[PDB]
Amino acid sequence: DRVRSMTLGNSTITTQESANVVVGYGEWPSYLSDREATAEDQPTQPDVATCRFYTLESVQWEKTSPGWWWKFPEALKNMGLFGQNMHYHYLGRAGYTIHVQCNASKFHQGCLLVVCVPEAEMGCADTDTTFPATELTTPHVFTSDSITGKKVQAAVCNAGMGVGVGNLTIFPHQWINLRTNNSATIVIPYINSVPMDNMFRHYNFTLMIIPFAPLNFTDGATAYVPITVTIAPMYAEYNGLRLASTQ
Amino acid sequence: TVANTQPSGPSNSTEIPALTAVETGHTSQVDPSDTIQTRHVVNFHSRSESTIENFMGRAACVFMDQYKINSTDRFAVWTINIREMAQLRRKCEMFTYMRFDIEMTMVITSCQDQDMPVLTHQIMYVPPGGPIPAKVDGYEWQTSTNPSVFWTEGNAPPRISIPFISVGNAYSSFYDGWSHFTQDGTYGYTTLNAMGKLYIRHVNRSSPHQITSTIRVYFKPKHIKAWVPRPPRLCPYINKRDVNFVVTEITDSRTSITDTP
Amino acid sequence: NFYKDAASSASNRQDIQQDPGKFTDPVKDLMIKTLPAL
Amino acid sequence: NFYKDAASSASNRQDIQQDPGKFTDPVKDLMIKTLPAL
Amino acid sequence: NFYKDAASSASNRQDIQQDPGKFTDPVKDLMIKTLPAL
Amino acid sequence: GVPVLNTPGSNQFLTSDDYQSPSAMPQFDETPEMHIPGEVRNLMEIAEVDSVVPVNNVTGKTKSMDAYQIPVGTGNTDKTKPIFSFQMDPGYSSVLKRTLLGEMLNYYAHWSGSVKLTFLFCGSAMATGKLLISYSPPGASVPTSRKDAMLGTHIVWDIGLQSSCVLCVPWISQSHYRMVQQDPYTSAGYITCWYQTNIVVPPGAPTSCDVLCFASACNDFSVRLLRDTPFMAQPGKL
Amino acid sequence: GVPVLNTPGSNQFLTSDDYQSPSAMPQFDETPEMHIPGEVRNLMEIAEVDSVVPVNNVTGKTKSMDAYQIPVGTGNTDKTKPIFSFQMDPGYSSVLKRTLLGEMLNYYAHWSGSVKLTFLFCGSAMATGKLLISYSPPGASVPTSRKDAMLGTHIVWDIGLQSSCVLCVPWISQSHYRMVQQDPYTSAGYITCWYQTNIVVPPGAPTSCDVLCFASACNDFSVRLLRDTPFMAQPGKL
Amino acid sequence: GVPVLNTPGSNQFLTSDDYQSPSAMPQFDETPEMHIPGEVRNLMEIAEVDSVVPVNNVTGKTKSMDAYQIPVGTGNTDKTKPIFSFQMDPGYSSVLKRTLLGEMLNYYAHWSGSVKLTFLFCGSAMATGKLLISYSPPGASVPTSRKDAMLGTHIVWDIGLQSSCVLCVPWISQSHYRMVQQDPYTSAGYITCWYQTNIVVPPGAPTSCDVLCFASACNDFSVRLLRDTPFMAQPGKL
Numbered sequence A: 001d002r003v004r005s006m007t008l009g010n011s012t013i014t015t016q017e018s019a020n021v022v023v024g025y026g027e028w029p030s031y032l033s034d035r036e037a038t039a040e041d042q043p044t045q046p047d048v049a050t051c052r053f054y055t056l057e058s059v060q061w062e063k064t065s066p067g068w069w070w071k072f073p074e075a076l077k078n079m080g081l082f083g084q085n086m087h088y089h090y091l092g093r094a095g096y097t098i099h100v101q102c103n104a105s106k107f108h109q110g111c112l113l114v115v116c117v118p119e120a121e122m123g124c125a126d127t128d129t130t131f132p133a134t135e136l137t138t139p140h141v142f143t144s145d146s147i148t149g150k151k152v153q154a155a156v157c158n159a160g161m162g163v164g165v166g167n168l169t170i171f172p173h174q175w176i177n178l179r180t181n182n183s184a185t186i187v188i189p190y191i192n193s194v195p196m197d198n199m200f201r202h203y204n205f206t207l208m209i210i211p212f213a214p215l216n217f218t219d220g221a222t223a224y225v226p227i228t229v230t231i232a233p234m235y236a237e238y239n240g241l242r243l244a245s246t247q
Numbered sequence B: 001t002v003a004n005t006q007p008s009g010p011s012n013s014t015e016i017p018a019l020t021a022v023e024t025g026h027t028s029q030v031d032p033s034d035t036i037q038t039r040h041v042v043n044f045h046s047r048s049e050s051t052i053e054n055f056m057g058r059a060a061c062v063f064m065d066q067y068k069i070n071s072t073d074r075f076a077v078w079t080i081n082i083r084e085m086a087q088l089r090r091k092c093e094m095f096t097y098m099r100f101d102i103e104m105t106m107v108i109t110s111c112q113d114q115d116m117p118v119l120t121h122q123i124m125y126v127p128p129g130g131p132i133p134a135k136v137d138g139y140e141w142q143t144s145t146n147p148s149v150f151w152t153e154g155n156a157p158p159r160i161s162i163p164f165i166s167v168g169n170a171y172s173s174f175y176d177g178w179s180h181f182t183q184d185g186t187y188g189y190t191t192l193n194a195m196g197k198l199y200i201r202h203v204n205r206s207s208p209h210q211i212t213s214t215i216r217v218y219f220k221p222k223h224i225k226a227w228v229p230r231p232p233r234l235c236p237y238i239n240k241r242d243v244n245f246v247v248t249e250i251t252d253s254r255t256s257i258t259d260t261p
Numbered sequence C, D, E: 001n002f003y004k005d006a007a008s009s010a011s012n013r014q015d016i017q018q019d020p021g022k023f024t025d026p027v028k029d030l031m032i033k034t035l036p037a038l
Numbered sequence F, G, H: 001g002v003p004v005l006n007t008p009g010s011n012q013f014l015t016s017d018d019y020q021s022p023s024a025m026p027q028f029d030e031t032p033e034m035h036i037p038g039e040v041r042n043l044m045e046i047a048e049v050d051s052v053v054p055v056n057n058v059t060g061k062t063k064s065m066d067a068y069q070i071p072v073g074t075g076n077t078d079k080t081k082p083i084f085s086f087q088m089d090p091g092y093s094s095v096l097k098r099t100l101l102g103e104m105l106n107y108y109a110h111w112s113g114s115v116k117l118t119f120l121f122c123g124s125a126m127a128t129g130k131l132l133i134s135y136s137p138p139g140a141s142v143p144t145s146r147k148d149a150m151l152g153t154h155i156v157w158d159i160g161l162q163s164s165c166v167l168c169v170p171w172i173s174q175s176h177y178r179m180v181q182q183d184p185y186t187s188a189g190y191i192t193c194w195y196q197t198n199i200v201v202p203p204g205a206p207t208s209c210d211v212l213c214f215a216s217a218c219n220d221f222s223v224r225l226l227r228d229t230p231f232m233a234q235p236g237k238l
């Protein structure tokens, strides 16, 4: 039960050392029902053009790297037809199979926390101002210090949202322990207070990858150990066609 | 009630309850009946007081402001939010989405800075977009369709029930998103907080001496449904319109890893 | 119930429900306590 | 009902009735949505 | 009973019970009033 | 007698309460009920009735009749320019805040449902044309060309014997209700009109016509949170 | 009318009461209920979820990531010294007062049930070892040797493919509940860790590894007396 | 709502009332009930238990052990003199106001039923005797001779193997209850002891023995009107 495969919309994912997929809060994503819907317009359901695996830019994991975060759905804009249906539609749902994968040898050690946090409302570096939208969204890095300026407070102990970073285990999450597994798959149903929401101005969840045990290896092992994020929306549907937004 | 402890004996077998893998995102479901030898004990302990209705169902102070009798300091205005005070904020910033309807209780205590006759207070609530009064003889105060409470001192505190008045299927404690569609303007939960201002004044026309009343609003959530739990707040509450923070130590320190009192 | 409105009612403190399975073990493949994890 | 008088009673807020046909289409000759107006 | 909580109730003054046998004669071997003690 | 306990909220006056009160005039014989034509039992009966929309409310035309009529002409210039354009939210929009839809909507804080815009063409019987009336949900800017506007929920309206057309704004919203006041979180889209072809008129007919606009609610329309209207603005004693 | 008698407690405001109150907004149409994933109905659902325990919270490592990781090495020195040691009571203990178990426990005055400590080994796949994690109830001092610590409820944890182990602290108490605050009458025991054998590592693997600790509640865990948390400590107006 | 009428006694605080009051801690999970040995459900269970009576409470023997023991000797002098004599009313009598019968009786104003006095002889096994313990109801003076005392309800107690005797004071009263405080209308009789024959002791045994007295209630004993005890007499802040 360590080997697993995920095939979505002409893109399959192979893993051979992995924990089983974690279904966020025990709910598998699905299309919006007729009783819980709010928009009387026929939604667009391109199941194979958008609901497929998209591979983000990989990041180098070093001995002193604090962590990273992505903000979805927005991070998936201008990527395939999933980003084109954002610009032309006003509403959207998805279910985001998140496949974070980081391989190593049996002579490397380290432990990542791959956690999906719904509504990770970040905090500004200077407590009396507001920071631009380019700060939130090459994933932004945490820092093992305290930054100052018109930035998101990207310290690691307070994970950006101002909590204990060890208490991020309450969210749907996995661990990549390099002796056990080299990938972590999290399935996230559509979590929001509203049945459909705009995908640009609203970040439904953020993906935080935080090494609790840092990477360590002796001389001779490969120093370049990259972390690759492969996110695939599921059961994505759109509503409210209009002219394309320039963003 | 909570689960009883089943009796176990000495075991020597190829089954391993203690051996787990945390990296599966899985919390082990083991009991003390799996690790050691236990006796049969009947647990009559219940989890009745840890429920969300009992936890959140206590009236917490959410607003204090003064308004004087005999200008704009003659009446109070609140523009309703939970974020005014820290203790109820940390309970509500513990769940991402939560759906409840609240009753509010006012504690109005007038204090002299010549004898006050009797003080009658008006707590007028304007839903968002309504006409705001800029004076005590505003004309707004007549409440044709605004809810309003008239209270004279020396009586029970004014308690009225409020429904779930949110536009969305739940109140959102956190909103990781922007106000405008171009990702601009106001960031955070402030955008979602569209609940009307709360206006409090003395319906007494004047007074022979300066009387300063203070109001204390106590929300108590009831019929509570909460979704997506999140960790409690660690660092303090610098602002009211944003979750901004100074970085703080995660836990109190020790001198050594072995050191213990 | 002395009022028609449902928000104008007593708090339903009596009911006690819980589903800790959606937080402690949200995994797809069932994991037995007895068996090894992998 | 604690009083004999009918004006000394609670407001009958519960009932919900409506007949928008006497304002939106008060016409004599019935007009079908499908058909042309004339 | 106008409250759900059991501590928020009237004092149960009405009930009258007593077992003075556990204080006046706690002895193991039964002692008859008629018979000598030893 | 029976032991009672005074809870909070005693001896208060909540204005929106439902209590019984002693009658000042006991055993009063009311006037017998009579059937008066046109009983309204719900305010959404009288918000679903059409009402002319002052679309041309430019500076200098509001206190007149020219506010209601939309100038539509026959020419070669400015056929790639909108005929009109305004906010779709009937509470704060400076065009349809005063309609019967907007007058009954400003007593409320939340509103849901579809609104529909009816366009009466008030030209001659010989003048024919085609118009594109489009609705585009928010998220992007106002459509600046007819190409960008025909991507929203539009209708191409041929002008003939019927001479009237209904654009039903289909309630594409994220939430179940929207704020009547103007806030970014729940803002309605844009209603623009364009020339599909042109207005074509015979030699002797007047070449400058005008479209008259209407707006009402659909059958799924509802208002949700009572508040006071901001329009009246009493200054003092009458 | 009916003769009534006003008892004590009338016209008071008890904050934790259960009374009916008149609705300010009668006949309000609430937003229809929708299914949001992950409904929590009890706070002991979210205290039974694991959370990383800052065991290495020495002076200078708390405001960092090194607070969570427990240094475990391969050497000849200090193999008769504990790896860690801390109080078992999750309310006042300077190690696990901040965990999810300790955050939800500090809103309460009394607590009952078994807690369990899960230890994730974050070394290499070739490095193997054995560890003794022991719990000793109060009454004696802290165990100072592994001989004194293997008399309590311990576990010898072989480190291999599973790479994780659960020490269930079995709730050996005199009373049914314990105080969350620190008092002598109801004080929990001690959780010490020892080297059963050693950590053995191949020539090319890194010789300094670390154990990562977890803590959560069992299914028989309950909290009993609501109080305010001491952590927030508001100084003034925000 | 329903018309009510506030009677006298509203908004008062009577200390001995039976009203329901709102719970400060709703849905509180109490500690499970456990069986503790020796549950007392009535204070007349613990007034019917014997208790040693300080009959010899003369000046200089009260703050000692000699208050409890009654000196009984073997001689030729003073065999027509009482051994002891005291009031039978267990509330104000300076002998049995402090017994367990008198401690639980001083919380009450009225009392009814029979009390019984048990006399344990604490001499040697070879010393034998006979004693006359008599009760005489009021109306006359204290019996000054054994002739006048054997007219009341007496008992001639032979001292042997049993070594204990019970004088049941038979509740000869005019009314159903008596005052615990000392008033002439309801005053109990007198309990005197006399030598029936003598105490006879062998040559080598100690010639001065002593009788130890007890007092408890019977099964028909009851107390009737709650009041405060006068013994505690707090002076000020503790």
Ligand SMILES: CCCCCCCCCCCCCCCC(=O)O
Residues within 6 Å of the ligand: B080, B081, B082, B092, B098, B102, B104, B123, B124, B125, B147, B148, B149, B160, B162, B165, B171, B172, B173, B174, B195, G024
């Ligand atoms: C005199 C009339 C008083 C009426 C007062 C109405 C109060 C509005 C409802 C309270 C708002 C609750 C918002 C909670 C949002 C969150 O949980 O973050």
Ligand SMILES: Nc1nc2[nH]cnc2c(=O)[nH]1
Residues within 6 Å of the ligand: A028, C028
């Ligand atoms: N493939 C798949 N479909 C589902 N539909 C509901 N649950 C599931 C699931 O767990 N897996």
